[PDB]
Design a protein around this nucleic acid. Sequence first.
DNA 1: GCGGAACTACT
DNA 2: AGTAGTTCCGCG
Length: 903
Amino acid sequence: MKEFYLTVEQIGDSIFERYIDSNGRERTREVEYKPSLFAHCPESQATKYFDIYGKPCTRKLFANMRDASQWIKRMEDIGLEALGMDDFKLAYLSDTYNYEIKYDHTKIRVANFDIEVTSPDGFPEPSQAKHPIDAITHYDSIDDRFYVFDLLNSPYGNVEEWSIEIAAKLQEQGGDEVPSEIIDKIIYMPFDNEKELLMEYLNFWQQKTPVILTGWNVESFDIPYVYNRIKNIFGESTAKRLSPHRKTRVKVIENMYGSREIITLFGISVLDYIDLYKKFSFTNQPSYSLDYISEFELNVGKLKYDGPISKLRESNHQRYISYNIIDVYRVLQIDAKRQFINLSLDMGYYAKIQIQSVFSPIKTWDAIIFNSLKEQNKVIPQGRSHPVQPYPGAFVKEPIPNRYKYVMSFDLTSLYPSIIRQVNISPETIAGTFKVAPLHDYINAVAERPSDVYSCSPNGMMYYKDRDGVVPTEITKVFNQRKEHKGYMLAAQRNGEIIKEALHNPNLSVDEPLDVDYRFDFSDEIKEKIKKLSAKSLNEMLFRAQRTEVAGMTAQINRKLLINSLYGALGNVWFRYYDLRNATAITTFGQMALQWIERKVNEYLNEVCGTEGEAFVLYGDTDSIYVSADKIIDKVGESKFRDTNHWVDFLDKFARERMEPAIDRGFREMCEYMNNKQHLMFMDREAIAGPPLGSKGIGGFWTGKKRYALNVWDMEGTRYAEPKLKIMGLETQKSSTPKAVQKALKECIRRMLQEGEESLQEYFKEFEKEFRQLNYISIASVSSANNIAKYDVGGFPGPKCPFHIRGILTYNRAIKGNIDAPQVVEGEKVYVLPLREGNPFGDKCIAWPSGTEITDLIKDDVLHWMDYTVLLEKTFIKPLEGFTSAAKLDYEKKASLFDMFDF
DNA sequence: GCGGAACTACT
DNA sequence: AGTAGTTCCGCG
Ligand SMILES: Nc1nc2c(ncn2[C@@H]2O[C@H](COP(=O)(O)OP(=O)(O)O)[C@@H](O)[C@H]2O)c(=O)[nH]1
Ligand SMILES: [Ca+2]
Ligand SMILES: [Ca+2]
Ligand SMILES: [Ca+2]
Ligand SMILES: [Ca+2]
Ligand SMILES: [Ca+2]
Ligand SMILES: [Ca+2]
Ligand SMILES: [Ca+2]
Ligand SMILES: [Ca+2]
Ligand SMILES: [Ca+2]
């Protein structure tokens, strides 16, 4: 079909691009690309080229890129603007693919790899690569195979080959539980020497050069390690062969006692999945280990193996290798579920950029606006720098800490991109300034109307209402494109059902899969043929209908992610269209809006319930307001409600038929007041929360800004079977807290909201004793010792020493003169427990090796002096009180039943 | 490292 | 205790 690119690169004066041919073959190309730039000219030399300001420009075509750059520097001294796209890779993509790109991921080579490197001393530093690579599994998507390169005769031991027959059996037999559907997709290659092994790994890499490279943290470890290693042994010029163009660029970094290398390989796109998972996940994981995330996303357990990690190879090789493969596999399962690489390509090919530039909102948007502008003979402004300096932020109401029974919230749609469209804020729409009053004067409609000819903002800017802005025109385009892909998706997910129903009655015969476009609901003619098709054809059509559905879905998650990252570009000094005054016009507007709708709602609810000065808005998000329906319920006794599911119904209607309308009216009166281009502030109710009918629960509470808990029944229309707990900033998932205390802290919240003060106390008492009876290692902690030697002063903790190092020294002191005891080594991993004051160890804590169990040398004292109380009060009662105090409760009664017996 | 949450440590 | 100063994630 139409060809698409794989990678674009600027190597001096030529562009090096890898692409897919019109006949589907992968091809490479070199092009001494000849760029163009622009310069302003007089109103008599004008042609067809204009900047966003309307002033004419003349084109300048250079012989090569070096000249073009050279001409920009030169143009700088003269003091004249150099308009035009200065990143020549994007201009070349815009010229070579002047049409919507339609790609076929099935022709794109995506590589996923992980390596293993045995280390006696500390964690192997990549920038040094002193330790040999004894394993390396490479999964190629084109071939759908797991290529395992297993070493066999290292300076750290020699071993037996891996056995696939074993690998698939139950561990309870010696097997490694390697998934079934993976066993036949493995190609095991055993080697007798590293240098050998390594060379083969390169022939492999040239014969199957990745286009996209993934793994779990391959960017800050695996890649630099493989690079430096090969370098060390064969030379940087036979290491640069990991680059299809023999060009690399090594960047170095280091802070105090940490240092790293990130080797950018020319001609190949690196999308580290961890880096990727942290961006599109939108879920803060308290940890990002392959192990933790794999559990979260796959409810799969941390593969077991005993002994210290640094010797798992000479100890047990079989399992050593099997856990290398499993891990590469766990990463595919996460992608097969999150589909993040697939989202990368889509967004990448949409903006026409290098796929990795997806991590940068600046590049992506810069390309979109450029391409949009170029198709109109428009010339982009030259990027000039400006001093970084903050401006007002998001208004966040300081809530009065307390309990809140009935609460329903309202959110306004895509607030910021929406302001940019309402006020018409863009760099070339600025039209003036006005004498500005205090912000309070504006939220209260006390100040004078700024203008009757221009669109304004509370900060003092005015914009042109007669012309569309470059930025706002672009936002609207992307917004309308989502609606388009929604439809395609729904129609494909709909044509999908039709096809399945057909499959219930396959026609015994031989036919073909119909030639139809799945983005559109099938015609009656098609539907009628479906019923007669065979099972082969039909099953095919289901694939293709299913393919089309996912495609339209990713397309819209894309336009959605895009729109949300725009404000991030417009506020960044390095964005080509940045302007401090505009960035501030958006932020000051958003503030005013929120506090204006606040006054209005407080106005409308006090009138409707017949009262005065009452405050119904208890808290304000940056784009949300939380209202307490307390009186709105008291207005109806709360004894006239059948079940709880009844009042949820009632409030649901009271917000749609009365709340919403009074809100829309208010946002329009503000649109005129500020005289804006188009009214776009849409604030719809989203959540309904409170305590189960006829219960003692409190409903919810706020401790402070961004810290609250709500018992939610309905969210934007969908009624929950079981109420859901919404927890924000109460830190109930600290990595520092024992898993059992995380579950207990969440339990006290549910009981406070759904059951009540009484029910709370009962439970605090319960967890109290059950916690004091937990195994030690249960409540222990982990961290590693990677700078103990320094912190060590004559055997004791030196100044500013870290807790775990204190333990690693305390342990270190009780083991002097013993050889059976597991020693702690620089870089290893350890366990830490707080010791009770007065212990035989002489310090407040102690640590020990995580790879083996506590020496019988100290075990008994450790168990006897473990400081349960300090942990219990530090991780469970200190935070618990924050909730209770603010909510006006007590997790323990001071006076109980016994003080009736006059003992 | 990055960027930074997220932990000590001090006037 | 706010405000200021450190560790350090993820990788064997
Ligand atoms: N319009 C436009 N072109 C740019 C800018 N920067 C570099 N160019 C280059 O301008 C040329 C585009 O002109 P083109 O559309 O082919 O002109 P025409 O087709 O002869 O009218 C290409 O070499 C672009 O890469 C820019 O900011 N705006
Ligand atoms: Ca790894
Ligand atoms: Ca590993
Ligand atoms: Ca990284
Ligand atoms: Ca049939
Ligand atoms: Ca919100
Ligand atoms: Ca208006
Ligand atoms: Ca909504
Ligand atoms: Ca101190
Ligand atoms: Ca220091």
